[PDB]
Amino acid sequence: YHKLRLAIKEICKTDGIPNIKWGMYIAFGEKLLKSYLKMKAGSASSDMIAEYINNAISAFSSRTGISQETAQKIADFITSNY
Numbered sequence: 001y002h003k004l005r006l007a008i009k010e011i012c013k014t015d016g017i018p019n020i021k022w023g024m025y026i027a028f029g030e031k032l033l034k035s036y037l038k039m040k041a042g043s044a045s046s047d048m049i050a051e052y053i054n055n056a057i058s059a060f061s062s063r064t065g066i067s068q069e070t071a072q073k074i075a076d077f078i079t080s081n082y
């Protein structure tokens, strides 16, 4: 997901994310994209997709030094581009 990784880095720069943390946001985004595409391909409902995304953002944002707002921007980039 070369294009995604690039886009996540730009989101990280905009949000002033400490660079030691970027790998974590990249991994979160790449994993979420793969799961989102699988769910779309299989005609998951809107409710199911929202629940999965919200669960992913909740779990990731529960880590210290991680921003829920930036996690949400990444999810939003995915759902608006893929």
Ligand SMILES: [Cl-]
Pocket: 001, 002, 003, 004, 005
């Ligand atoms: Cl990509």
